[PDB]
Symmetry: C3
Subunit: 190 residues, 3 copies
Amino acid sequence: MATIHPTAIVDEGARIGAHSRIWHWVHICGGAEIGEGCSLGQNVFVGNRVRIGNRVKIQNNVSVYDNVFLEDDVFCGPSMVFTNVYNPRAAIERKSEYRDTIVRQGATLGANCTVVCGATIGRYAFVGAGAVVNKDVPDFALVVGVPARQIGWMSRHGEQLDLPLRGNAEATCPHTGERYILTDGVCRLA
Amino acid sequence: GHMATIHPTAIVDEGARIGAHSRIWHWVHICGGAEIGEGCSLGQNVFVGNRVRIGNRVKIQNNVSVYDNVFLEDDVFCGPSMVFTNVYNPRAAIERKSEYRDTIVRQGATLGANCTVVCGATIGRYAFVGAGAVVNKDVPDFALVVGVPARQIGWMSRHGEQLDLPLRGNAEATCPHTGERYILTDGVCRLA
Amino acid sequence: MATIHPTAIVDEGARIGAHSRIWHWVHICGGAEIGEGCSLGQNVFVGNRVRIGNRVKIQNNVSVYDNVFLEDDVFCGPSMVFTNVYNPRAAIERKSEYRDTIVRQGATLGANCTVVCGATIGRYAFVGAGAVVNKDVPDFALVVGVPARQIGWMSRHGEQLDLPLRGNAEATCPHTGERYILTDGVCRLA
Ligand SMILES: CC(=O)SCCNC(=O)CCNC(=O)[C@H](O)C(C)(C)COP(=O)(O)OP(=O)(O)OC[C@H]1O[C@@H](n2cnc3c(N)ncnc32)[C@H](O)[C@@H]1OP(=O)(O)O
Ligand SMILES: CC(=O)SCCNC(=O)CCNC(=O)[C@H](O)C(C)(C)COP(=O)(O)OP(=O)(O)OC[C@H]1O[C@@H](n2cnc3c(N)ncnc32)[C@H](O)[C@@H]1OP(=O)(O)O
Ligand SMILES: CC(=O)SCCNC(=O)CCNC(=O)[C@H](O)C(C)(C)COP(=O)(O)OP(=O)(O)OC[C@H]1O[C@@H](n2cnc3c(N)ncnc32)[C@H](O)[C@@H]1OP(=O)(O)O
Ligand SMILES: O=c1ccn([C@@H]2O[C@H](COP(=O)(O)OP(=O)(O)O)[C@@H](O)[C@H]2O)c(=O)[nH]1
Ligand SMILES: O=c1ccn([C@@H]2O[C@H](COP(=O)(O)OP(=O)(O)O)[C@@H](O)[C@H]2O)c(=O)[nH]1
Ligand SMILES: O=c1ccn([C@@H]2O[C@H](COP(=O)(O)O)[C@@H](O)[C@H]2O)c(=O)[nH]1
Ligand code: NA
C-alpha cells in the first residue's frame, strides 16, 4: 500500500512495504526490497541487489546501488552518494568485484557525503555533511572531513556525548539522560 | 523557434508564483507554496519546496534542491549540484519539522558547484563559496570561503575576482574592472 | 544506433554512436557528440559544446556541460560535477569566458568529485571520491582531498604503483606486467 508518484518507475518484481512513499522520477529496479514507512525523494535510484529496512528516509538524488544494505531507521541526506566499485576503470567491468556497504540501524549519512564501498557504518553513527567515508565508522561515531575522521560521539537523539574518543568512560545523552559506556574506545548503550 | 518558458516535463504545483521571463528546465518540481521572482533560471531536476522565496535573476543550476526554509535574494547563483539542508542533526526516527533552521542567502552571493550549506547559516551579500566547500558557519558579505569545513581565505568583489584586502583590520581596495571602492572596517567589508 | 530509454530526451542533431546506452530521464542537447559503447546513467545532462569519446561510462547525476571534452575510456563516477565558468555571478553572463575541461583517455573521476574548469586531467589519472580538482592532474596521478593533492600513481588497471611520489623510478603492474617510468615526477608507460 506504498504510495508511488505517477512519474516514478517501479520495475516489476520490486517489493515496497506498506506506508512507504516514493516521490517524483524515482527508478526502483525489480530486485529491490524496501521496507515499511520508508520515504524516497525526487530522482532516487535503487538497484537490484539492495535491501532497505523499515522507516528509512532517503532524500533527493540518492543512488542506492547494488550491494548497498540499509538497516531500519537509516537517514540518507540530500544528495549523499554510495558506491560499489572501489577502483573503477571504464575499460574493465568490475561487477564481480563489488564491495558491500552496510549501514546499521539509526545511522545518519549527512547531506552530500560519500561512502567508499566496503565500509560498514555503525549503529547511530553520524557522518557530517560532505564527509568522505573510506573506513568503517564505529557505532555512535561522529565523523567529518575529506576523508572522514572521528571527532566525537553522537547519542541516538543526535547530540554529542561528553565522552573521550579512547579508553574507558561513561556519559549521558544531554537530552534523554540515557547512559552510554565506552570500553577500549568502543561506545555502546548501557 | 521561440524562447523557452517552462519545459513540458516540469511539474509546477498549483499555487506556485513564478515571475516573468523565468526559465524552468527538464523534470523540475516546484511545490505550491513557492515564490520565484523574475528572470530566474532553474536547471534540470531542480526541486523547490513550499516554504521558499527566491528573488529575481536567481540562477539555480542542475540538481539543486531548494528545500523548505531556504531563502534566496536577488542575483544569487547556486552552482551545479550544490546542496542545502533544513535540519541540523537529522535522525530518521525523530520528527524535526519543528526544529528546522532557516538558511538565508543574501544578494549576489555565489554558491560554488557541489558545495553544501548546513542549515542555519547566513550567506552574506556577494559572498563566494568555493566549489565543494562545506559551510557550517555564517559567511560575511564579500567573503571568499573554501574547504571542508569552509574557511575564509579572501574577499571577492561584486565582479567576482579577489580584492587586495587583508582578512582583518582596516583597509581599502578598488575593483580594477569597475573602479568600485571597498572599505574594510575591523574585518567587515562593504562597498563604499 | 544507441539504445535510448523512452523517458530520455535526445534533441535533434545529437550524435550518439553504436552500442551506447542512454538511461532514464537523461537530456542530451542537439550539438553533443558521443562515441560508441558509452553508458549515460539516470538524470545525466549533456550540453551542446561537448565531445565524449568511445566506451565512456557516465554514472547517475553527472552534468557534462559545454566545454567539457572526455576522451575514450573515461569513467565519471556517481554524481561527480563538472563546471565551465570559473567565477560565476548571476548578474554577469560568462558564456564568452568559459574555460575548457579536458579529461584524457582512461582517467577515472571518482564519485562526487568536482573539477574546477580549466583543468586537464591526465591519461589514466584517478581522482578520489569527493575530491575537488583545481589544478592539472598528471597522467596516472592519484589525487585526493579538498582541494585535490597527489598522493601516488595508478596503473591503467587501477591499483597503485610501487613508485615514489616524486623523483625518478620505475615500476611494473603485477596484473599485466606493463612497465611504467617515472622521470622528474612525470609517469608514463614505457
Ligand atoms: C556505481 C559506482 O559505484 S561506480 C564506481 C565509483 N567508485 C568510486 O568513486 C570509488 C573511488 N575510490 C576511492 O576514492 C578509493 O578511496 C581509492 C581508490 C582512491 C583508494 O585508493 P587506495 O590506493 O586503496 O588508497 P588507500 O585507501 O590506501 O588510501 C591512501 C590514503 O589516501 C586517503 N584516501 C583514499 N581515498 C580518499 C578519498 N577518496 N578522499 C580522501 N582521502 C582518501 C586514505 O584515507 C589514505 O590516507 P590516510 O592513511 O591518511 O587515511
Ligand atoms: C532536507 C534535509 O536537509 S535533510 C537533513 C540533512 N542535514 C544535514 O545533513 C546536516 C548535517 N549536519 C552537520 O554536518 C553538522 O555540522 C553536525 C551535526 C555534524 C554538527 O555537529 P555539532 O556537534 O554541532 O558540531 P560542531 O558544529 O560543534 O562542530 C565541531 C567541529 O566539527 C567541525 N564540523 C562540524 N560539521 C562539519 C562538517 N559537516 N564537515 C566538516 N567539519 C565539520 C566544526 O567546524 C568544528 O570544528 P572547528 O571548531 O575546527 O571549526
Ligand atoms: C555550469 C556551471 O559551471 S555554473 C559555474 C560553477 N562554477 C564553479 O562553481 C566554480 C567555482 N570556482 C572555484 O571554486 C574557484 O576555485 C575559485 C573562484 C574559488 C578560485 O578563486 P581564485 O581567487 O582564483 O583562487 P586561487 O585559485 O588563486 O586559489 C587560492 C587558494 O584557494 C584554494 N582554493 C581555490 N578554490 C578552492 C576550492 N574550491 N576548494 C578548496 N580550495 C580551493 C587554492 O588551492 C589556493 O590555495 P593553495 O595555494 O593553498 O593551494
Ligand atoms: O539550450 C538549453 C539551455 C539550458 N538548458 C537547461 O538549462 C540549464 C541552465 O543552463 P544555462 O546555464 O545556459 O541557463 P539559462 O540561463 O540559459 O536558462 C542547463 O543546465 C540545462 O538544464 C537546456 O537544456 N538547453
Ligand atoms: O538493469 C539496469 C542497468 C542499468 N540501469 C541504469 O544504468 C546506469 C548505469 O548502470 P551500469 O553501471 O550497470 O551501466 P551499463 O554499463 O550496464 O550501462 C544505472 O545507474 C541506472 O541508471 C538500470 O536502470 N537498470
Ligand atoms: O509535499 C511534499 C512532500 C515531499 N515531497 C517530496 O518528498 C521528499 C521528501 O520530503 P520529506 O518526506 O522529507 O518531507 C521531498 O524532497 C520531495 O521529494 C514533495 O514533493 N512534496
Ligand atoms: Na554532490
